[PDB]
């Protein structure tokens, strides 16, 4: 369990109610009994959500942001804060969190290569399971959308009139 | 050369002037000395424009439309008429020509498979040389467009302010 002074300060510094902080601390200790989470465990957790990808790179980048004090461990105070900002923060706070994710070397700037590395990390993890933007208009999907819209009577055939009217 | 009665009727039945009909007849005989064009030559011509693709399927489908009387040859009267409609016809005429291309078995209807076959024929011919719709928003292009738009001072780096303002 969590001391009452700790629950009061954490509730104060985050967007969660006291009950929700205590429910998050339970889940933290359940899937992290030592009370401390290192990069290896972070990666293994992301591997449960994405078994068919390589979550190494992206998990490492996200671990960099969770680890506020950059000591190699994620204590609960860092765990809850990241969740509070990423899930219930203002747009400016979420964007600051995102800037930090994209700023891999933590020098205060995002380079083209850093941004490319993030997208490559995301693709390595989810590329082969989630629908991607470049797959929205593949040739077969284009044909299916045109033909469905032109086939007004849905008989599976296109008359010239359907083809002409549908072409406009 | 072309008889004056032939040039008068062809000019009448097409959108070309007499001089243009005679210039098209010259080009026809130059790249088709026998005065008759069969499927093999049609395919070989399309192969000159697309050496790295397989223009067989698409050339065959287009030859089907050129060959109005479906006798296996493209005479000049068919050659000039196809060009006149495809290049200078009304929208309704161009669409009728296109419907005929897409109607592979010439039964008056376009099925899903017929439309898919046309797109597959086009891809076999130009797929590996022309830019495709599904390639417009690939991950690298998305990154380049976001980063270029967010990098206002074009120094190659993104400050938090640039990232925030550009995110909106
Ligand atoms: C919908 C409910 O889950 C969420 N709500 C979120 C709100 C915002 C962000 C994230 C998110 O993705 O943060 C990044 C992230 O991703 C990832 O996989 O791990 C982490 C840390 C959220 N997650 C997903 C999540 C996954 C795992 C844990 C976790 C990690 C270590 C130890 C215990 C737990 C745990 N404690 O209680 C549990 O149920 N597990 C926590 C949260
Ligand atoms: C910009 C100038 O070319 C065009 N203007 C067009 C207007 C509308 C459509 C087409 C088009 O693509 O028709 C389908 C098509 O495609 C293809 O490759 O062959 C064909 C027949 C056009 N073409 C391209 C073209 C290519 C080859 C020939 C051709 C074929 C056989 C014998 C002689 C010639 C010839 N006679 O004079 C020449 O210069 N060549 C004719 C035209
Ligand atoms: Ca830490
Ligand atoms: Ca950086
Ligand atoms: Ca129909
Ligand atoms: Ca013919
Ligand atoms: Ca048909
Ligand atoms: Ca800049």
Numbering used by the authors:
A (entry chain B), B (entry chain B): 7 to 174
Can you quote the paper on this entry?
At the molecular level, NCS-1 contains two pairs of EF-hands and a C-terminal dynamic helical region that inserts into a surface exposed hydrophobic groove and acts as a ligand mimic in the absence of a binding partner.
Crystals were obtained for full-length NCS-1 in complex with ATV and NCS-1ΔH10 in complex with AZS and VLZ (see Experimental Section). The resulting NCS-1 structure, comprising EF-hands 1 to 3 from one molecule and EF-hand 4 from a second molecule, closely resembles the canonical monomeric conformation in which EF-hands pair in a two-by-two arrangement without domain swapping. A single molecule of AZS was bound to NCS-1, occupying the upper region of the protein’s hydrophobic cavity. The interface between AZS and NCS-1 spans a contact area of 468.8 Å2, comprising 490 interactions, predominantly mediated by van der Waals forces. Ligand recognition involves 15 NCS-1 residues located within EF-hand 1 (helices H2 and H3) and EF-hand 2 (helices H4 and H5). The carbonyl oxygen of the AZS ester moiety forms a direct hydrogen bond with Y52, positioned at the base of the cavity. Notably, all aromatic moieties of AZS, including the benzimidazole, two phenyl rings, oxadiazole, and dioxolane, engage in π-π stacking with surrounding aromatic residues.
